[PDB]
DNA sequence: ATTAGGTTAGGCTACCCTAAT
DNA sequence: ATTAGGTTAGCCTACCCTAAT
């Protein structure tokens, strides 16, 4: 419980929302980044205010052009430094995840870049989710990140040397 | 459209719905206190959670002892108001229940236990309503109305007048008017499906709804 | 610690910092509520949105009118409590100030003026505090709001004493 | 201007400080962190309410055992970030401290005995601090002020210099 | 009565600041 | 440093609601 930066896991968010193909809406982040809801109806007028995303007609949240690059960026640093972190590192593959949502927050445009070089293929994570936006860093098919982060039925996942009855809302989960 | 005090008001209601003998359920306090349906049930959901009451396997609500005993104090409270704000302060009759029903909420055990002292009797409330748990503050009952009419009509005296009926303005201010107070003589008929009072030639057609609301005796 | 109406108590205090002669800040509001800064700050903003006062140039507070004069209906109705509660209640006179703290937000103006009524004079509050505003009702010399409320060097005062440097300003005469 | 982590800069400062001989006063802390004097004096109480440093009857700041231990935890995760920034990631040497100023503050202590592995000798940082505190993980030199000092630094880089005239400041810097 | 998604009012702490002592 | 007074971000709870089940 510390989202290091709460602006970016709400953008974050919305962006694994659209990719899980689900609508972002105030609610998904709210039980998603488990925060009461007027907590993020709030956090995110702030958004709004700094015309980062804006609040549909219909509740849906839309990234404006500049909250969706930034949504991208943190992806992509996230995804950079899992492969980093297991690649290079050898962290334990649970940890790998977490280390990651922490660390999205406070890496530099300049260490991904080296991290790009560094690193071997970063078509994708380790999880197989495909590392956006590297065309503006200026150089099973996958689990989705949501799925990451349920740990115990994700373990229950890693038990069966996957690289398992699934609940109907981790479904749409894994890609 | 302020309680003044949520809980306390959602108590003193199924204590309410229980004097009349109607099952308190969520729907009950939603339609008197007009609140909606989700908003009520997660309300009380909050009570249940802070031990005040709980909802039996049949839907209805049972107050935990711990919910009785304030429910209890609450109309306790409010009735020896309502005596101090006519006896005493001598505040318009039709005014005085909703004063009460602010009052209720703010008024100590202590100015209570003055009350008593400085009040005559602390039997009932202005309107006939007894006063309860005057016991944990250290220190009759009538026919419905809906019960004693008749197709043919009879002089009858007013005894109670329920807590929810003074609620019903249009319904009140009327009866109010026809001038009739605790203790007048009254006529009562089962008229074509409806039961009616008349006070001063006046003629007051009580809602079927209501008919239930008003106790009467025999002169 | 429940204002009842937090508005109101807000207004009544800024009343009250004006009768003592301090100037009314949000930091006095703070202290005298025991409520956080940022937290007086936004409840006040709300009012402020709702014309009810406004924050100086120099941060200090005035009501608007409106303010002013709900502000005042709420020592008005206060002090008749009080009045109401000692004089025909006969409630303990350390209590009483209390009970009205929490009376003068739920009492009518009907009621205010059968009290004017039933009660003998109503210049002033069982504490000597001038009763105002009974205009627009349509109707040693005193210890302010502020020091009945300090319950320890109030109970000593009436065990009648130093009073506390802040206290000093408080009892006027 | 984002310490990541308050508190943690805080104690990373005094033990800092300690360090460089100085002595740890509240004043330090405000210049070095670029805060105002109420607001450090403040957060520093917080500190202290949370038994982790005590105002000395002197005004100086000692660390209680468990402030210590943690200012600890940070430097090591500090060096230690920096050592794999340029050993491995290969960052610009210049941008490698700030970075780690970061990372310290999100670094988990897992990755850091993965690092201690997957790194040669972990005895000092890049600039030659030694690493702390390595005992308890259950596993000459410019000071961390000086590599912060970004224009007197890179002038220092300019003269080729691996672990000229120094600011009278930045004087005990250096051992 | 519940599921789904919001709301306002009122309150809080951590952390940061300028001015005047 | 401290007094004095205030500020933003980030959070929570008690309560209320409508639309759709
Ligand atoms: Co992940
Ligand atoms: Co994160
Ligand atoms: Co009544
Ligand atoms: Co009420
Ligand atoms: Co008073
Ligand atoms: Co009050
Ligand atoms: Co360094
Ligand atoms: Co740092």
């Excluded at chain 1, 510390?2 to 970016?8: G, I, W």
């Excluded at chain 1, 980044?33 to 007028?45: D, I, K, N, R, Y």
């Excluded at chain 2, 909420?105 to 006063?131: A, C, Q, T, W, Y």
Aim: proline share 4%; glycine share 6%.
């Amino acid at each position: 419980k510390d989202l290091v930066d709460t602006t970016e896991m709400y953008l974050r968010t919305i962006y694994e929302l659209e990719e899980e193909g689900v609508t972002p809406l105030r609610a998904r982040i709210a039980e998603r980044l488990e925060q009461s809801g007027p907590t993020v109806s709030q956090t995110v007028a702030r958004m709004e205010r700094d015309g980062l995303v804006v609040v549909a007609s219909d509740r849906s949240l839309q990234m404006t052009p500049t909250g969706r690059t930034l949504a991208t960026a943190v992806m992509r640093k996230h995804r950079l430094a899992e492969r980093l972190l297991t690649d290079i590192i050898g962290l334990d593959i649970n940890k790998v995840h977490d280390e990651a949502c922490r660390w999205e927050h406070v890496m530099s445009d300049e260490v991904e870049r080296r991290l790009v070089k560094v690193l071997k293929d970063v078509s994708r994570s380790p999880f197989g989710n495909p590392i956006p936006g590297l065309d503006e860093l200026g150089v099973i098919v996958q689990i989705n990140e949501i799925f990451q982060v349920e740990t115990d039925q994700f373990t229950q996942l890693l038990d069966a040397d996957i690289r398992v009855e699934l609940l109907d809302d981790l479904a749409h989960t894994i890609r | 459209k302020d309680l003044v005090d949520t809980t306390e008001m959602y108590l003193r209601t199924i204590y309410e719905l229980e004097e009349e003998g109607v099952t308190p359920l969520r729907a009950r306090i939603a339609e008197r206190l007009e609140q909606s349906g989700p908003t009520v049930s997660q309300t009380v959901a909050r009570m249940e959670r802070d031990g005040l009451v709980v909802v039996a396997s049949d839907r209805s609500l049972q107050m935990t002892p711990t919910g009785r005993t304030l429910a209890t104090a609450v109309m306790r409270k409010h009735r020896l108001a309502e005596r101090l704000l006519t006896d005493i302060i001598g505040l318009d009759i039709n005014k005085v229940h909703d004063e009460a029903c602010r009052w209720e909420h703010v008024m100590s055990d202590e100015v209570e236990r003055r009350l008593v002292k400085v009040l005559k009797d602390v039997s009932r409330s202005p309107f006939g309503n007894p006063i309860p748990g005057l016991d944990e503050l250290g220190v009759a009952p009538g026919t419905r109305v809906i019960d004693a009419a008749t197709s043919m009509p009879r002089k009858v005296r007013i005894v109670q007048i329920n807590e929810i009926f003074q609620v019903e303005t249009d319904q009140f201010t009327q009866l109010l008017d026809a001038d009739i107070r605790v203790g007048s003589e009254v006529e009562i008929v089962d008229r074509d499906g409806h039961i009616t009072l008349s006070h001063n030639g006046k003629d007051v057609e009580l809602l079927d709804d209501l008919a239930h609301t008003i106790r009467i005796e025999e002169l």
